[PDB]
């Protein structure tokens, strides 16, 4: 009753990911302790709350894939726009080759010379 | 047999293209894996070369890569 | 005469079309939900009794309403008059008018009901539950009188279709107000028979499509206020066009009509216990099953299944933001956390984790295992992502930049491509031929493919059904044995896979088998048993060989999945593999005569033989939820001595939460998977002969209750059907004796040969065409309603000749030819799959050769039939590969040497079934 | 990476199609193609021993085809009238000559 208790292949192998997913946990709560998770979280009935609002209220940067401009213009259409009851601000649109993309060349006659699916990052305003 | 030699072709000429890091560039690798998988699907040995001297020009644009 | 039209207007729409006068009208099939003590089922019968008048709208125009005046003895036209008498004031109920004609030289009375549709709700169910695009009149003169559709919409083609043409959801989803409207009148028709004393059976075929009620022929008056319905059979029959047809929908509206905006529900909800029993109290009052919203209080895997079909319903009206992992803030050594104490799942409800340490003191390996795969870290710290390239859920992204992954084209094997062209291959006007390439793929490839999932739709199954459908299933599966096993006997070959989400940053599968103690193995076991650990998928694109330039994907599912499912079932999936004889036939290698085995046993001893096969289309993509926890649970039925209820329920939610509705890695983001297999997790190939038996044992049930039980002239088989629909809609029991009866019914007259998602049918035919068991017909009718999914007859067989096998199975044909005074089936491949396989190469043997001669060998192998092949250029194949294998030996430089053809030969005979 | 490259030729010149041949002789000669030749084509033309023996008129024999010329610029940059070309007064036409047609 030994390699019940112990490893096999410790060797400074079981040390190695143990301190990878400890300081991939402390550089993800680095970037997340901040208080829209307070006052999120501390308006529930009993601190608990479903996942899929956590980043819907709480997260300060958005990325809107477009695949098309007739999807662009009814969507992040100017450099402020609207999404889950938020106010957006646009920076920095990319394209699929990670190149910068103007906001001043995204119209129906450039259409084709852009390689279409946009990234658009904005910042949550206030 | 002269379908199986185009699509034999095809597949290696797609792979000289690709080692030649044209898949750094999304709409051009985008036209040349349609022009690859429409040979390779294609039933007709004529638009199979249609679709080769389309695809072999993808590779001779680039004003220079080997033709000694 | 003209006076009879006169009598049945009476004093409602004067305007009647005369459409009858004698006992006529009576040209047409009706569906009917009978049961008595002579037949019983609900199948297509002639109803000849009616006279039914047509009214006609002003202006002349005819309008969907008739006069249904039926000729009665004088008994029963008193008893329904009474008992009309008593239910009159209740709104959900037609009028009808009693009268007395003198025909001859007798006052013969007359039941005129008023102002009924043309069709009822049993016309509809059957239309929608016995598909078939040949004869669907039925369906069309509904969908275009009620304003679902148009006339030429069914010009488009494929219309019936729901892969392609998907508008049919929104044509059929303009029923929905309608069926809700006949959902209400049954519940306003129970409460005036309760509240009357009137006990009966409520039947479909007795309401029509507006909602209102009649035939009062069956019902008996009782003390008022006793009164008990009986809607055992109603609701379960309508159950499954409930999902269908979208009833629900105006639920989420205001103040539950269509014409008003959403209800804004609050964010950080997520409970909904009291809007899902108001739901059931609401549609299903009189259902008198107990309904648990959260499947935690259910009592056994049957009251599991039972209420998540309910569940399944109910949650389409509730917000999908508030469906998944429920998180909390906990505290280590004072550094807060998010992490996941909880799950809401849409078929299991809420479901509250047991061990949650708030306030923590250290993280040990096992709680940073857990911690590191929770999603709830992963996406509460990434950026907010709307993705507009697809439809399904997206959560977050977890970078500043999507990745874009493509697939590399094949490697030209351009010596084996010479030397098969010097041969004499590929010449002009061949049979055997290039066919199977490697198609490259674009960027838009790993999300364009993760979009098919749109093809899984929230279905409710006829629950009636599916709980005897479970048990002849488990009958199938019980010559097995499994159980919990210890982490010190679990034995993991292939220790370099994937490891999942974010454990793929460290390692493959050996580094978590070397890092984690026996002790720690189970303590997380033991854990998950306890609680819920919701894990991330990584979706990879795959690269192999294929004759569709499709985009072929691969999962890999975290590692703190894939070591609790190893011991939760390696034991029955190593008892399932390792058994020769059976109908799930995995894990029997084809070789030293088993193809022949495999074969003589489907044969059994089926009296008028023809053989079957089918697919279903988009199966991993469109398997439904309640088919995939239906299959789990009959998988851990094994567990009866080792887990009590509570554990194998919190191990069932941990195979829900992880491998059905799991969050799913795709590019660099996270998008919610609603359902369907992994092709990343050992079970699936089980999970689906489970799902494949389930659908081969409705579609029985279905050919043996829809047909006239006044024509089988099989007494035994009346019987049989007649048990049958009393063991289905009444009898909540489970009757074992008649469950054995079953069975063997089947295994007599319909023996199957199941692999995941692959199945070859022996049948007698003779019962086929009277309609006793299941034709291709009824498996495209159960497809249709239960898997949303359309099943054309060019991709299912049928050989009438034994002595040529199945068509296909596990992508191999089957040849009957010599060994020896013994007649043997062989199985041989496609040969163009061959030559490309041999041809077109993955760069990992383009640089060793003895890689190389262990990939020509094993093709050489699995090419050694065709040599039996009555077509030469198959014979050729094989003789091509050995001259290769043989050049590429002496390249390098008796029944064992792979460069002679007796090596190959031996393989095939069962004489020498050494490995 | 050599290797796969003189693969890939071989394999061209065997399979002997008229039009392939045509174009690798054009890019073998220094008449390149800029885009992927459309089944809207512009070409560079090195010089007029080049230009001559392929471009007739406004007729453009490539990939064993026709085009009609639709614009032809030459190195500097400015639209250039195609009936200049000359075999004496050749020299101030700049000699890269880009140039655009349509498929007939
Ligand atoms: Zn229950
Ligand atoms: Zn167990």
Known sequence: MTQMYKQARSEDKRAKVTSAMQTMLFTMLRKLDNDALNNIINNARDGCVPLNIIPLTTAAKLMVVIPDYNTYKNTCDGTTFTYASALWEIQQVVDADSKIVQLSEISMDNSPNLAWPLIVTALRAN | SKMSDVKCTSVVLLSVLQQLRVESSSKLWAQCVQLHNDILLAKDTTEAFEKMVSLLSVLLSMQGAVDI | ?915
């Open chain 3, 1 to 915: 005469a003209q006076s009879f039209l006169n009598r049945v207007c009476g004093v409602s729409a004067a305007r009647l079309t005369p459409c009858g006068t004698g006992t006529s009208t009576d040209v047409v099939y009706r569906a009917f939900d009978i049961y008595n003590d002579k037949v019983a089922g609900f199948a297509k019968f002639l109803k000849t009794n009616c006279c039914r008048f047509q009214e006609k709208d002003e202006d002349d125009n005819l309008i969907d309403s008739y006069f249904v005046v039926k000729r009665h003895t004088f008994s029963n036209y008193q008893h329904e008059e009474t008992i009309y008498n008593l239910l009159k004031d209740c709104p959900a109920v037609a009028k009808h008018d009693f009268f007395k004609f003198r025909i001859d030289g007798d006052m013969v009375p007359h039941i005129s009901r008023q102002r009924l549709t043309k069709y009822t709700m049993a016309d509809l169910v059957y239309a929608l539950r016995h598909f078939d695009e040949g004869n669907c009149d039925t369906l069309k003169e509904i969908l275009v009188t009620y304003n679902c559709c148009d006339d030429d919409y069914f010009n488009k083609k494929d219309w019936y279709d729901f892969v392609e043409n998907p508008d049919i959801l929104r044509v059929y989803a303009n029923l929905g107000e309608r069926v809700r409207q006949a959902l209400l009148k049954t519940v306003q028709f129970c409460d005036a028979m309760r509240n009357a004393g009137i006990v009966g059976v409520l039947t479909l075929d007795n309401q029509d499509l507006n909602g209102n009620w009649y035939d009062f022929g069956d019902f008996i008056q009782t003390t008022p206020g006793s009164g008990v319905p009986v809607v055992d059979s109603y609701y379960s029959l309508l159950m499954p066009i409930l999902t269908l047809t979208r009833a629900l929908t105006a639920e989420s509206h205001v103040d539950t009509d269509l014409t008003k905006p959403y209800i804004k529900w609050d964010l950080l909800k997520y409970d909904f216990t009291e809007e899902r029993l108001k739901l059931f109290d609401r549609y299903f009052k009189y259902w008198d099953q107990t309904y648990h919203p959260n499947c935690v209080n259910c009592l056994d895997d049957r009251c599991i299944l039972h209420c998540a079909n309910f569940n399944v319903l109910f949650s389409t009206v509730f917000p999908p933001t508030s469906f998944g992992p429920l998180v909390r803030k906990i505290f280590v050594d004072g550094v807060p956390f998010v992490v996941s104490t909880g799950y809401h799942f849409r078929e299991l409800g809420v479901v509250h984790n047991q061990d949650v340490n708030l306030h923590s003191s250290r993280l040990s390996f096992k709680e940073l295992l857990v911690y590191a795969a929770d999603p709830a870290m992963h996406a509460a710290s990434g950026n907010l992502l709307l993705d507009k390239r697809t439809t399904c859920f997206s959560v977050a992204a977890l970078t500043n930049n999507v990745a874009f992954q493509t697939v590399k084209p094949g490697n030209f094997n351009k010596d084996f491509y010479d030397f098969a062209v010097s041969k004499g291959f590929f010449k002009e006007g061949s049979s055997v031929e290039l066919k199977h390439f490697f198609f490259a793929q674009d960027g838009n490839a790993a999300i364009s493919d993760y979009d098919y999932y749109r093809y899984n739709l929230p279905t409710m199954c006829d629950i009636r059904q599916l709980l005897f459908v479970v048990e002849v299933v488990d009958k199938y599966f019980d010559c097995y044995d499994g159980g919990c096993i210890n982490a010190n006997q679990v034995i993991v070959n292939n220790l370099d896979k994937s490891a999942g989400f974010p454990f793929n940053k460290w390692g493959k599968a050996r580094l978590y088998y070397d890092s984690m103690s026996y002790e720690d193995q189970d303590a997380l076991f033991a854990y998950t048993k306890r609680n819920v650990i919701p894990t991330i998928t990584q979706m990879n694109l795959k690269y192999a060989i294929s004759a569709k330039n499709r985009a072929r994907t691969v999962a890999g599912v975290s590692i703190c999945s894939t070591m609790t499912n190893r011991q939760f079932h390696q034991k029955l999936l190593k008892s399932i593999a390792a058994t020769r004889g059976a109908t799930v036939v995995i894990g029997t290698s084809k070789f030293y005569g088993g193809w022949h085995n495999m074969l003589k046993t489907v044969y059994s001893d089926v009296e008028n033989p023809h053989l079957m096969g089918w697919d279903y289309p988009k199966c991993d993509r469109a398997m439904p939820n309640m088919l995939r926890i239906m299959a789990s649970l009959v998988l851990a039925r094994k567990h009866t001595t080792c887990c009590s209820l509570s554990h194998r329920f919190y191990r069932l939610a941990n195979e829900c939460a992880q491998v059905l509705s799991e969050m799913v890695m795709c590019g660099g983001s996270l998008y919610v998977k609603p359902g369907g297999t992994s092709s990343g997790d050992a079970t699936t190939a089980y999970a689906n002969s489970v799902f494949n038996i389930c659908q081969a044992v409705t579609a029985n049930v279905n050919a043996l209750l829809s047909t006239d039980g006044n024509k089988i002239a099989d007494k035994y088989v009346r019987n049989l059907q007649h048990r049958l629909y009393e063991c289905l809609y009444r009898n909540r029991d489970v009757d074992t004796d008649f469950v054995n009866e079953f069975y063997a019914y089947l295994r007599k007259h319909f023996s199957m040969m199941i692999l995941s998602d692959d199945a070859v049918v022996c049948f007698n035919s003779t019962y086929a065409s009277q309609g006793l068991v299941a034709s291709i017909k009824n498996f495209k009718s159960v497809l249709y309603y239960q898997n949303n999914v359309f099943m054309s007859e060019a991709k299912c067989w049928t050989e009438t000749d034994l002595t040529k096998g199945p068509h296909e199975f596990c992508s191999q044909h089957t040849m009957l030819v010599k060994q020896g005074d013994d007649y043997v089936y062989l199985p041989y491949p496609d040969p163009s799959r061959i030559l490309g396989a041999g041809c077109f190469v993955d760069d990992i043997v383009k640089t060793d050769g003895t890689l190389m001669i262990e990939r020509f060998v094993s093709l050489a192998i699995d090419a050694y039939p065709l040599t039996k092949h009555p077509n030469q250029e198959y014979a050729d194949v094989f003789h091509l590969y050995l001259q290769y294998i043989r050049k590429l030996h002496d390249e390098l430089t008796n029944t064992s040497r792979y460069w002679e053809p007796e090596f190959y030969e031996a393989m095939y005979t069962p004489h020498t079934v050494l490995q």
